[PDB]
Amino acid sequence: AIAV
Amino acid sequence: GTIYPRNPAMYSEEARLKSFQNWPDYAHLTPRELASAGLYYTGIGDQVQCFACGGKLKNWEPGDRAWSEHRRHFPNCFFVLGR
Ligand SMILES: [Zn+2]
């Protein structure tokens, strides 16, 4: 996942 | 206290679980796993947020686990460190  | 959750209402795991009512059908991780890791649904895409640190995660990939992504991105979160 990626951090926003 | 000396720490404070970004979202006190989402303090409750049951409240986090309810937030996944409209979790999208393509999003492969379960509400159960996500809520257990402190995460609730923001209502946008597959984007979730931690009630404790306030970190936000999106674009989940096959093989991702909720806790390991939470700890990798937000290692200083009190929920991560209290586990
Ligand atoms: Zn967190």
Numbering used by the authors:
A (entry chain B): 1 to 4
B (entry chain A): 151 to 233
Quote the paper.
Therefore, the structures of XIAP BIR2 with five different peptides soaked in and bound to the Smac binding groove were also solved: ATAA, AVPI, SVPI, AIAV and AMRV. Next, AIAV binds identically to SVPI, but with an intermediate position observed for Gln197, which does not have to move as much to accommodate the valine as it does for the isoleucine. The Gln197 can move away, resulting in a pocket that allows longer moieties in this pocket, as was shown in the P4 Ala→Val→Ile series. We have shown in a series of peptide-bound structures that the protein is somewhat flexible and can adjust the conformation of the side chains in the binding groove to accommodate differences in the peptide.
